[PDB]
Amino acid sequence: MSKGEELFTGVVPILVELDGDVNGHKFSVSGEGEGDATYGKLTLKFISTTGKLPVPWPTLVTTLVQCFSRYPDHMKRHDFFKSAMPEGYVQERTIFFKDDGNYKTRAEVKFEGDTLVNRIELKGIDFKEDGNILGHKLEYNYNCHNVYIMADKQKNGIKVNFKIRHNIEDGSVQLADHYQQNTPIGDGPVLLPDNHYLSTCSALSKDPNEKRDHMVLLEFVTAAGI
């Protein structure tokens, strides 16, 4: 239970802005959409504003609002994300794609007025040029996964972990090992959960009326494990 929680009882409009630079390649992405935590549902649409993306759409999914996760009642006390609202939280990650480069990200998620805003910068290095990433060798798809959460009393927030399995055109799968940390931007109290995870599924598609490089995303998230 948290006041922040009261901010997500309805459908909330979403804002997404990303500035990134991978192996010097620069780009920007914008997303608009809405979230319905009651159903743990996200529906967003992403647009490249800088032309054909240097990396695949699927590698940016993680980066591109866990506060929209559906917390069943018996877990309401474990919802750091909502509790940090409206002030928000900073979400930082280091993502390692096996046998390739890595992304380092930092973002701020908070309300801006009535819109929940996800503001991110990303920096990627070491990609192998003809690698699955620079190679655009991944399938435009996505698996369900479990995101593990635990409290970080010293950070006054959480420590998050998981491993993304990206399907590869040759029928192989490439791993994107995720390390994440979240901390409150604000100074009010937050919920510091016992250990748990989020059951997450995403489905990507495309907008037939859309000319720019883009991604249509639908995602369902529900907390479990306590």
Side-chain angles (χ1 to χ4, degrees), residues 1-25 27-51 53-109 111-127 129 131-152 156-162 164-210 212-226:
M1 263 177 346
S2 87
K3 225 116 147 210
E5 158 151 279
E6 293 309 319
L7 247 24
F8 293 86
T9 295
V11 175
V12 186
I14 306 160
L15 135 148
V16 184
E17 286 313 333
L18 175 50
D19 281 303
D21 155 340
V22 172
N23 285 28
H25 320 273
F27 47 107
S28 311
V29 159
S30 295
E32 27 96 356
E34 72 172 52
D36 192 9
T38 301
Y39 277 99
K41 206 174 100 154
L42 291 167
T43 71
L44 283 160
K45 143 150 199 215
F46 304 90
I47 243 7
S48 161
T49 66
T50 53
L53 276 217
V55 291
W57 273 115
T59 61
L60 298 179
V61 167
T62 51
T63 295
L64 302 165
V65 292
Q66 287 164 337
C67 52
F68 278 112
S69 307
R70 178 194 178 255
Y71 276 74
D73 301 54
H74 66 301
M75 324 219 355
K76 302 319 237 280
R77 200 101 212 145
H78 300 279
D79 201 345
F80 161 86
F81 316 94
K82 285 174 220 78
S83 87
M85 293 288 168
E87 298 83 294
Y89 59 78
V90 180
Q91 189 164 269
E92 279 165 296
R93 279 229 182 77
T94 278
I95 300 153
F96 301 79
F97 301 91
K98 183 139 183 205
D99 323 317
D100 209 336
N102 59 70
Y103 291 169
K104 306 197 149 241
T105 62
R106 147 171 197 127
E108 275 178 339
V109 327
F111 289 74
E112 293 183 26
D114 313 284
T115 290
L116 186 275
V117 130
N118 184 16
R119 24 168 71 109
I120 331 139
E121 252 196 286
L122 174 152
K123 194 100 123 185
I125 65 191
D126 298 339
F127 289 84
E129 250 304 346
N132 284 165
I133 293 58
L134 316 141
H136 288 287
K137 308 218 192 165
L138 349 160
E139 303 201 321
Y140 188 74
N141 61 206
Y142 217 88
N143 302 315
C144 289
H145 300 84
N146 317 118
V147 171
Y148 301 91
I149 307 171
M150 40 171 233
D152 193 331
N156 189 30
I158 56 179
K159 179 174 129 174
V160 177
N161 82 284
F162 66 102
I164 284 310
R165 288 189 351 284
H166 293 293
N167 277 191
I168 267 74
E169 304 188 301
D170 59 27
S172 72
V173 167
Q174 134 115 62
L175 295 199
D177 179 21
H178 280 66
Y179 298 87
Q180 153 197 347
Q181 189 65 51
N182 296 72
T183 44
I185 278 181
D187 277 27
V190 304
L191 298 184
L192 289 206
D194 303 326
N195 281 12
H196 63 293
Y197 64 109
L198 303 177
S199 168
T200 310
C201 301
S202 324
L204 321 193
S205 63
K206 301 289 216 197
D207 173 12
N209 315 134
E210 155 84 44
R212 333 163 84 175
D213 198 358
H214 73 284
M215 170 175 66
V216 174
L217 185 145
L218 168 75
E219 173 157 302
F220 302 82
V221 199
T222 300
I226 337 230

